[PDB]
Amino acid sequence: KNIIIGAMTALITPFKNGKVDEQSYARLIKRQIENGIDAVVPVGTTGESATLTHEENRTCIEIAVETCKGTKVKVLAGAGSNATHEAVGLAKFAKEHGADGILSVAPYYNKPTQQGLYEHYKAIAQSVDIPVLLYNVPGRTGCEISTDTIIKLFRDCENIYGVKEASGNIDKCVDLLAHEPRMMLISGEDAINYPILSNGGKGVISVTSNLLPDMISALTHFALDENYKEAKKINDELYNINKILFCESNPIPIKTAMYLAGLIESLEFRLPLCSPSKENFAKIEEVMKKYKIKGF
Amino acid sequence: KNIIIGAMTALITPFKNGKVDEQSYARLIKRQIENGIDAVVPVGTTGESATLTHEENRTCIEIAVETCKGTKVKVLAGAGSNATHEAVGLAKFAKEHGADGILSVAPYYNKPTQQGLYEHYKAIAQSVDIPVLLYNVPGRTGCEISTDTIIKLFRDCENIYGVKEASGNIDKCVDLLAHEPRMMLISGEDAINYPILSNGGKGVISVTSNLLPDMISALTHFALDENYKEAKKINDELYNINKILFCESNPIPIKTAMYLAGLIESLEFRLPLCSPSKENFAKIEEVMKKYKIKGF
Ligand SMILES: N[C@@H](CCCC[NH3+])C(=O)O
Ligand SMILES: N[C@@H](CCCC[NH3+])C(=O)O
Ligand SMILES: [Mg+2]
Ligand SMILES: [Mg+2]
Ligand SMILES: [Mg+2]
């Protein structure tokens, strides 16, 4: 299969006066490229896909594709939906507008059965000829793609190449790669990036890398070379910020940190997301002081 | 506060060749009216709100309003979204098209904080002048509206009048009505309708009533009349069907049962929902045989 692996960033979506700040977005993507990131993920969970319109989802993908041209950096477009017809539409748009692949979250809220998840992803995969990465995040979606369903989809659909796991379940990571070692297991949980990579995972789709792209890139590339001492050292150093960036629901802490770092102009969300509490604002600020944050 | 309480049905949405079967929908609502139901809820979770378009969500509300006009039966329109701007748009449409109130699910997938939930629902409640019922279902949304947030919304916003609880947590039900006895607590979990009503809950928004509207409305009316012996008797009789209707994710079993009863023409869902397993299909059919199912 064709694949998108390595160190990848779930891009935040900056707003100004309620609209997508398109210049800021392109600028933030350039900063990721310049700090060793292998791929960017526009409009995932961290990018507030829920509150963007379909048009804005499409715009953000286009900005990422245009910004990455002439570089090695890939665009793994956020194209998921809890409605299969919507997910197919977003997948097709991403393919026709030059994305290298798509990330497709398990349907949220309507809790499909494993049979329904299989048919959902089969319909998406049959609709494009670019790579598709599954994305399991049960704490947000209310459902879990089982190991059996992931393995069946990987084996049955030529362009489904692996899964982004955000489930805090290293037993499942062992189960996946022990029964199907050819898939690309991708960490979607920054605190346990190193354990996932050391069991044979082949990349990360990171929140922390919005702020510290050089550290996440270094961690991943050390691990892929089996330089596990160095990769573990960075993973350990990053633990405190990796956890504080979830002191409130992602992306509230990461946007707060990007604002505190001067990397975005305004600390704006779309409702129902909003600014953190004053106490957590202070906690985020305090933890940031322990890390060197690259500018532009 | 203006309120919508009593026995209410979370209407299934029948499909024919992939489209909303509008004549079937109207026929199903008339059947609810004939069997003592006090209000209907178009396009809630049970109505496959996730896979309807915004236009179909609006069409179903219109059909409900029109079918109920000139009867005692109210329309509590499903108008929720995980994006506040979408939720406000749906609320306004329901108001302008004659719904008696709206049901508004807590944002799913993006996990707002309690502050965010307060601002979400305050924005919705300020956009219309009809009653708003909150809706807590953490197993599907990934978030919980806390008791403190519900009570503040009830006290601070004139039209927020209560909450549909689908959380399996009778302790929270006690907490809510012990600290704010003026709110309308509505059962969103059929198996425990009687315990919620016996603690001072004032209605149900039912899945089972799609199939057995006479039994659910009787249960509710016995309880509101303080005949706890008879309300409990019906709740107990209904336990087996109340549980089997969740052997797979709702509304997969209830649509299967409606098809098996001859009340809808075809067993059609929109992906990612799909037909149940053959084993669960047989289980639903077996349990249904023990109940008397009203026709048209
Ligand atoms: N709020 C809806 C629509 C989002 C459309 C853009 N990603 C959802 O989360 O599915
Ligand atoms: N699938 C999206 C859009 C639904 C629009 C109609 N209710 C969601 O679940 O939020
Ligand atoms: Mg197979
Ligand atoms: Mg900015
Ligand atoms: Mg009545």
From Swiss-Prot, chains A, B:
GO-annotated molecular function: 4-hydroxy-tetrahydrodipicolinate synthase activity
Active site location: Y135 (proton donor/acceptor), K164 (schiff-base intermediate with substrate)
Catalytic activity: L-aspartate 4-semialdehyde + pyruvate = (2S,4S)-4-hydroxy-2,3,4,5-tetrahydrodipicolinate + H2O + H(+)
Pathway terms, separated by semicolons: Amino-acid biosynthesis; L-lysine biosynthesis via DAP pathway; (S)-tetrahydrodipicolinate from L-aspartate: step 3/4
Keyword tags: Amino-acid biosynthesis, Cytoplasm, Diaminopimelate biosynthesis, Lyase, Lysine biosynthesis, Schiff base
Classification via Pfam families: DHDPS
Residue numbers marked as site, Part of a proton relay during catalysis: T45, Y109
Family recorded in the similarity comment: Belongs to the DapA family.
Subunit organization: Homotetramer; dimer of dimers.
Protein name, entry field: 4-hydroxy-tetrahydrodipicolinate synthase
Gene this protein is translated from: dapA
